[PDB]
């Protein structure tokens, strides 16, 4: 049936974040007054962490594991859905319709998303999500 649910991982195909992997936080099938089309509120990774080896020290690993996130409202036609899933319970509250309207609650939302993504990547979950797409 419907696969564009919360927690679905997609690849952005248009815009500044083209080719980057996001996770859908809030779908909107019927649109709204702003963005009058089917769209989704997503959180993704702008700057992927670098690969680390056995020889890297603590400071180098800390530098190379940094993640810069972003939050975006994106049209459905500009998303390519995948078969992968990602838990969005940790930042479900901070990514909302009113987050984008107010400058700048986006900063707090991105801080929450950055902390969640970095903790999950350090835990070692969602290797495909945290791996950069090469094209």
């Amino acid at each position: 049936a419907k696969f564009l649910k919360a927690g679905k991982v997609a690849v952005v195909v248009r815009g500044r974040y083209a080719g980057k992997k996001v996770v859908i936080v809030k779908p909107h099938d019927e649109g709204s007054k702003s963005h009058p089309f089917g769209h989704a509120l997503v959180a993704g990774i702008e700057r992927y962490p670098l690969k680390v080896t056995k020889k890297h020290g603590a400071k180098k690993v800390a530098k190379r594991t940094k993640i810069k996130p972003f939050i975006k409202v994106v049209n459905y036609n500009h998303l390519l859905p995948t078969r992968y899933t990602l838990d969005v319970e940790a930042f479900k509250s901070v990514v909302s319709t009113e987050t984008f309207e107010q400058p700048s609650q986006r900063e707090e939302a991105k801080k929450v998303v950055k902390k969640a993504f970095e903790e999950r990547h350090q835990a070692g979950k969602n290797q495909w999500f945290f791996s950069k797409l090469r094209f």
């Binding site: 680390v52 080896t53 056995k54 690993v61 594991t65 350090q122 835990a123 290797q127």
Partner: peptide
């Protein structure tokens, strides 16, 4: 170590770039 992964390279024909090997037998002396 959850941060490290095993990514073997395919050095077969039509695959990744060949690694450095001892070509002493083929040196144009």
């Amino acid at each position: 170590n959850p941060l490290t992964h095993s990514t073997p390279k395919n050095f077969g024909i039509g695959q990744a770039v060949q690694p450095k090997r001892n070509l002493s037998r083929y040196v144009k002396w």
